[PDB]
Symmetry: D2
Subunit: 337 residues, 4 copies
Amino acid sequence: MSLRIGVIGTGAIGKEHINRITNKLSGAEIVAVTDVNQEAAQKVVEQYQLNATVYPNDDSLLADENVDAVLVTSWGPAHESSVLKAIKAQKYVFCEKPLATTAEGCMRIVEEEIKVGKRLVQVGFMRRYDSGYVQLKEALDNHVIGEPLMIHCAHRNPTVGDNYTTDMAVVDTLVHEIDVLHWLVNDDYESVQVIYPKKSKNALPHLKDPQIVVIETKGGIVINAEIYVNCKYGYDIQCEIVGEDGIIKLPEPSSISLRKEGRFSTDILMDWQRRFVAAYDVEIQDFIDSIQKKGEVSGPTAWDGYIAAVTTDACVKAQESGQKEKVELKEKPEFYQ
Amino acid sequence: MSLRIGVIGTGAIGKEHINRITNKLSGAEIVAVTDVNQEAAQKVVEQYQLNATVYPNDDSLLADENVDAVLVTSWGPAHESSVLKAIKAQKYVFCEKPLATTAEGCMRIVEEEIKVGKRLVQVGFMRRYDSGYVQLKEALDNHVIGEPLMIHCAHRNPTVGDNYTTDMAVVDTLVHEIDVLHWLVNDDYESVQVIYPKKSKNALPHLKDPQIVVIETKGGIVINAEIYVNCKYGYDIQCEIVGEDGIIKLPEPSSISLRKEGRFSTDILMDWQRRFVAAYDVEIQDFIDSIQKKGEVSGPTAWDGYIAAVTTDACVKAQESGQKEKVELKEKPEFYQ
Amino acid sequence: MSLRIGVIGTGAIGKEHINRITNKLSGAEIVAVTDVNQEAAQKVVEQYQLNATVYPNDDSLLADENVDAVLVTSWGPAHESSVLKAIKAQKYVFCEKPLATTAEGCMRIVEEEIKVGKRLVQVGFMRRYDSGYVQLKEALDNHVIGEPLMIHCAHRNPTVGDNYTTDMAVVDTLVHEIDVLHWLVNDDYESVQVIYPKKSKNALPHLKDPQIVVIETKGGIVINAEIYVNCKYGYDIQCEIVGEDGIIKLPEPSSISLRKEGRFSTDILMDWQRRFVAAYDVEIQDFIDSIQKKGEVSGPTAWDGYIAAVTTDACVKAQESGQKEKVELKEKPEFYQ
Amino acid sequence: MSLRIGVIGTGAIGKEHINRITNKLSGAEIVAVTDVNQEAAQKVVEQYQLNATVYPNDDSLLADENVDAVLVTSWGPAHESSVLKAIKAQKYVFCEKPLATTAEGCMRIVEEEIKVGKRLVQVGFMRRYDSGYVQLKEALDNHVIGEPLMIHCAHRNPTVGDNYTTDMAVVDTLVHEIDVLHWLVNDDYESVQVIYPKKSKNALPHLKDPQIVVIETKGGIVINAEIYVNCKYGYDIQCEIVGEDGIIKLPEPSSISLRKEGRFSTDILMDWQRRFVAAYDVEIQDFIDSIQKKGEVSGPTAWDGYIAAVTTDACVKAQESGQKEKVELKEKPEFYQ
Ligand SMILES: NC(=O)C1=CN([C@@H]2O[C@H](COP(=O)(O)OP(=O)(O)OC[C@H]3O[C@H](n4cnc5c(N)ncnc54)[C@H](O)[C@@H]3O)[C@@H](O)[C@H]2O)C=CC1
Ligand SMILES: NC(=O)C1=CN([C@@H]2O[C@H](COP(=O)(O)OP(=O)(O)OC[C@H]3O[C@H](n4cnc5c(N)ncnc54)[C@H](O)[C@@H]3O)[C@@H](O)[C@H]2O)C=CC1
Ligand SMILES: NC(=O)c1ccc[n+]([C@@H]2O[C@H](COP(=O)([O-])OP(=O)(O)OC[C@H]3O[C@@H](n4cnc5c(N)ncnc54)[C@H](O)[C@@H]3O)[C@@H](O)[C@H]2O)c1
Ligand SMILES: NC(=O)c1ccc[n+]([C@@H]2O[C@H](COP(=O)([O-])OP(=O)(O)OC[C@H]3O[C@@H](n4cnc5c(N)ncnc54)[C@H](O)[C@@H]3O)[C@@H](O)[C@H]2O)c1
Ligand SMILES: O=C1[C@@H](O)[C@H](O)[C@@H](O)[C@H](O)[C@H]1O
Ligand SMILES: O=C1[C@@H](O)[C@H](O)[C@@H](O)[C@H](O)[C@H]1O
Ligand SMILES: O=C1[C@@H](O)[C@H](O)[C@@H](O)[C@H](O)[C@H]1O
Ligand SMILES: O=C1[C@@H](O)[C@H](O)[C@@H](O)[C@H](O)[C@H]1O
């Protein structure tokens, strides 16, 4: 008897999920969708031969009782609203970043969940399910390299749309690191600070590319995170964790080596879609399996999403001040941990 | 409406499949099993909370009509018998290597299939579904390195059981290469030959380890294939294809690099189970999806399995003669291709 | 007819040079030494079967006319004095870092050289002669990766003496980067800034280890330079230059790969002495050959050394202020370039 | 007081040596040359401002007493004659491969040396002085990977001259491996055998390219050695030694990594001249230093050269017979070891 899932946001990424759940994963089906382009959602449903209802809005869909869990995978700002609803409707919710565009927005969502007694919110920070990132977790948890001291890492795009704005860097993009980093080291972010290098020819003038973001944790770990979205050569995520006694570092994507025309190369991906495809599959399957066999979700908590929002805040603050902004994080509710 | 699958052979590897199909893959369920330790099969069924019938034998199970496809995943020699049956019962069959322990055995199976009009037999040579091996396929199909000329490759075990016999090398072990190699280059094996290096201390005396196997194709491609199952350091599969104008080579398994105590290392797997887990998942999902949306299976053909058997023959022949045995392959039936 | 060289400073490093010049290089001999442990100097002349005079001081030695060039390779602070002398004595001088312990000290040395009409001072920043660092230079000079934007690099020791002080990091250690970096990118250092991560267990408490040093150039290039001298695992120099369209990165020292006990490793050096041995050989040979066939020295200029001193200043300033210190560099005299 | 060296053979390679000795190495000078294009030799003495005599032949030059050691670096076949002479003239001789074009030719040279009481012959197999090959030696000598069992290695040219003949492969080319391999493992070659893969488009029809050469040692070690001189992509030497418990493998030449246009590459050399430049320098310096401080040469012995010749024989034999030729090696004279 499978888990019945409603998808709010029949967009590109919601479509990818509907697809994996329908044709790749196990133990769940899509019985309900609503888009804001109601027609788009109706086209999706035929596209993937679903047996699902098409609601005009989230309320209508959250109403429905043959649906016990929802994907919030719509336009970013409309997330918060949909989530709080689903929490009160006492259905399970998986929410693609952002959790809520604003920190307080996130906060409201936390408070709701602490009421409804259990863990219904999982945030879609898939990096935690990537095999490389997991091996990193595993190593640290094993003390392999002793006390973590600094972290060097980079997040690079070949290019971006004209739509890409100097803040999206720390908002849309650096957000995954912001989650995964503290996840790994199990520390909280004390301060952030931003430094702008010589703007790049491959970037449009209304955009500050690259950027560097230094971040300190409570413990004393220092992170420098390159973000460069017009690097032209490829899409490439890099993370090296220097420890007291050793260094561990994230792998490249698997690739066949080539010897030709003077060079000994491996392949670099050009399409962010490819880098994490398996992390998504694992992430979602975990939502499912986790629910059916535990009555609560498991991955990145509602809290973890708040931590993101605050920190993104401190970042855009530092973006404008070029000054060492503080990151004021609220009490971590006993509820969590 | 999902595909209903019967498993003949509730052993370790049949269990792994029952597990992935039940808890990992999409669009299929297990509705029928039979082991030869009838009790084992009954224990499996409870283990994985199945809703399946437990038959005393394959016949009983092939009888059943709520089953439209079967996994032959039992003890190696009992494969052939189960398969021919399932072909006449006009159900779909996925068969873990071997197809049939003897070449002619394979031949009977081919002839049956050519009668029953379509493609119901898929052989479990999962390497073809490994991402690395696929990139290799892709490159060649693209002529990247021009005409393939030689192949160097190795198949290494940390150790083996006391049960491991000097022929199992070319029978149980080198079989995957034997499939994947010709698959890649799209050529047939002309001759084989075996050379025994200085026997290894890590090997028991009743066993000849390592061994080298040279193989020529019709076209003129030369392959040398190390096989060494007591290499002590790990489990490691390596394949490099030298071409007219370039070289491509299989990747290592993804791994975090480490800098510690004087060395800059990556991880090597110790457990053959891990190396290919994802190839299995993909392989089986392909059986399923392929069936439901095409009315025929897709992967390694019944023919491809025969090719294996013949070639394993020529190998054990060369094993005893240390002489350049010929590989006499029969007409490839138009049926295939 | 070979170049006749006087060595002031018959210490460990001066000895290494006397050795390479006598038994490794071409076209020069040692005809004069002076130490401050006058006896230590006698012992050497014996050690290496020299045919050289032993002066009581630099003046005595600079007096001598059968000597046309000198190595200043004595205790750090005693450098300045010896060099100014040799400039007025109109002999050629190769000076191991530091040029002068203080910036002004360096300045006096520049002014002297601009008088004496030509180039007699070469500073021993050997990194510029390392084959890897040279390939980097070459690439950039060829625009391979377009406009350089950021640089990530690290300088790591296994451990240090009790003698090692929190400033030595930027004074003795980071100095090589400080030279090579701007050498490479052909830009001047605008600001520096220092950030102290969580002090390391492997470091004595009177010492701040690791440290991070951010540096901006006039042009807009940003550098973050890890310095960590108690990293325990090895001695390791790393440098990655991110450009507009590409990334180039310094190589590891050549090493045989090993597959054993679960890991696939390369070697890491433990002994800073080994990392650059060939850069020294090249560096010195270039002093020699450059002199005999050009009447002037070639490598890192007296100026380049001053640039170091100022920048080391700004660093120790930032060390104490944890504030973004400015680096005020004087006019670059036409003399140079 | 330096070593006085006569060069017989003022050709391209003899010139390279004259150059390194004059302008790179330590403790030796060139005081005597003879070519067969007597004029070519005059031009050289000028080219390199030597202070040397120009003899009309080797006899004239071996006569001379201000010369205590000679480079035999002339046309291949003329080697033997020049060497036997120099042995009787009781001068030291360094001889670039071949030692003698024929095995017996080598034999005569051995017998002469055993008479004249000591070691005066060093054969120019520079691979033994390459830093990578040395690390390999070192590892094995340390048992790191236990008993060596198989060796995979390859010797690849981008292309060759029209002058290149199907035997030159095993005669001019594979000769370095033939020396270094047995050097490393300290075993003698029992049999050889040759296998011709599908001839390559990049090769002229009068030439069989690639070739594979299998070789067994007395002990039981098996080697397969690819030789492919029209591989188009670069010049590349590769050697992997599989052992009882581990695998060690020769490094790539040092190179800066690049990230650009979708690929993550290192450089591959195109010019055999570059691959070993430092091994030559070391090799020759060792001849010098070894002589002056030991009264005998050190590197690859006259014997080692004979071993080459015999084995080259067995190879060209196998080249024509495509049959497993034997390698009949004579008693190793106590003289050696
Ligand atoms: N391209 C990228 O790199 C990444 C994109 N994403 C995420 O995907 C989400 C949106 O982008 P895409 O799905 O790729 O394209 P998209 O912008 O087309 O998705 C937004 C969709 O949801 C919308 N929507 C918002 N609230 C709704 C509501 N209450 N009811 C119905 N529809 C609603 C629209 O219907 C729209 O089609 C965002 O969370 C974004 O951050 C995820 C990872 C990275
Ligand atoms: N360990 C290894 O490296 C590999 C093992 N395998 C394959 O797995 C198969 C068997 O090994 P495992 O499953 O791992 O262990 P296993 O030997 O326990 O599996 C054999 C099972 O099927 C048997 N059997 C044979 N014919 C039967 C029939 N008609 N009805 C009921 N039962 C029958 C037994 O019941 C037995 O439990 C073979 O095909 C083997 O080649 C696959 C890849 C590699
Ligand atoms: N550029 C480089 O790669 C490099 C490398 C090593 C050292 N150095 C610098 O050079 C210095 C020397 O290092 P070392 O390893 O020889 O140390 P060491 O302890 O082995 O000896 C230093 C020597 O210099 C002598 N000395 C001091 N002042 C002198 C003077 N005015 N005249 C003649 N001799 C004098 C001492 O008697 C001593 O023998 C250090 O301070 C160091 O910072 C630079
Ligand atoms: N061991 C190595 O790494 C190595 C490297 C290069 C060449 N070699 C061998 O050495 C040989 C020389 O190569 P090269 O590059 O100088 O060729 P090259 O064409 O540039 O010149 C060969 C020279 O040897 C001279 N010569 C021939 N016989 C002579 C004799 N009896 N006495 C004096 N001079 C004589 C010729 O006049 C000519 O100048 C080749 O046959 C080659 O196989 C060995
Ligand atoms: O968060 C993400 C997106 O915003 C961004 O567009 C992708 O390029 C990133 O790699 C992904 O992690
Ligand atoms: O075929 C196989 C098994 O027989 C063998 O036992 C495994 O070690 C191999 O790697 C696998 O490919
Ligand atoms: O000059 C230096 C030393 O003082 C220091 O000890 C080493 O770490 C540096 O590598 C070297 O370049
Ligand atoms: O002696 C040799 C040459 O004849 C040949 O051309 C090169 O391929 C080899 O690398 C070199 O060792």
